[PDB]
């Protein structure tokens, strides 16, 4: 096949950031929706290391953006859960579904509230969030956010 | 009538919170506007401060109240590339495509003065990207003039 191989190579580069690497093994041929063991795809890794230039191109050449590992996790999961706003914003208008639930039943709201990322939580209320999902404990993001103690994303939340 | 209403302003212009709430308690008027026709709101939204901006809107400050050059707090934060205040008015109801005197919105602004996560939370927020104003020119065609690359792009993938 000559490859892949090339995605792990593609995987690798994304989760990097080093866009020009990511745009010749895509014009290799590099699978742009190849995934490795823990089912991650290069918009996995990209997204969650906050790579927006690379999650952009990444999308441009038809990486699916709604895209479960093995969690269950859509690369909007790890984004919102490390605090990447640009890339929640670029994933968003290309049409990632905001109330996606991993294998826990977690949305991305889930996720941003628990790690106390407030500017998340706003975008993604905006981008029509749905604040009052529980997970398969019965448990709602601003219940997650109180435990953790963060008081900023527990004001935001109790306000809608 | 007020003094009271200038020191609202001023407050909320230097993003003193506790200064601002006082006054409110103390009968200033929150939707109070200097001789520009600025409110409180006008003046937190352009210099970022999101905890005051908040705090105006639930004392019931109009989100959505034009200068004297038709702009709205978005305007001003969208000019001077505060995301966060921008996120806040949009979530209370503010006109993502209101027209200032030149008959531009927030997104020409934003894309003007290269604010990208701005541009990127208006679009979201549902802003028409392809508004042209009283000159006939979109955001994009402001973005290209002034060498904002990164909003040229994200303007483009559109």
């Given at each position: 096949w000559g490859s892949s191989e090339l995605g792990k190579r593609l995987i690798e580069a994304a989760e990097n950031g080093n866009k020009d690497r990511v745009k010749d093994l895509i014009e290799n041929?590099?699978?742009?929706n190849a995934s490795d063991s823990d089912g991650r795809t290069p918009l996995h890794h990209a997204a969650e290391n906050g790579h927006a230039e690379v999650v952009a191109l990444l999308i441009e050449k038809g990486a699916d953006v709604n895209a479960k590992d093995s969690d269950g996790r859509t690369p909007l999961h790890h984004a919102a859960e490390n605090g990447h706003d640009e890339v929640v914003l670029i994933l968003l208008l290309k049409?990632?579904?905001?109330?996606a639930k991993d294998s826990d039943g977690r949305t991305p709201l889930h996720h941003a509230a628990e790690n106390g990322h407030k500017r998340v939580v706003l975008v993604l209320i905006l981008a029509g969030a749905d604040v009052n999902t529980s997970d398969?404990?019965?448990?709602t993001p601003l219940d997650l956010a109180r435990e953790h103690g963060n008081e900023e994303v527990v004001k935001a939340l109790e306000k809608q």
């Open positions: 041929g590099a699978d742009v049409g990632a579904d905001v109330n398969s404990d019965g448990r």
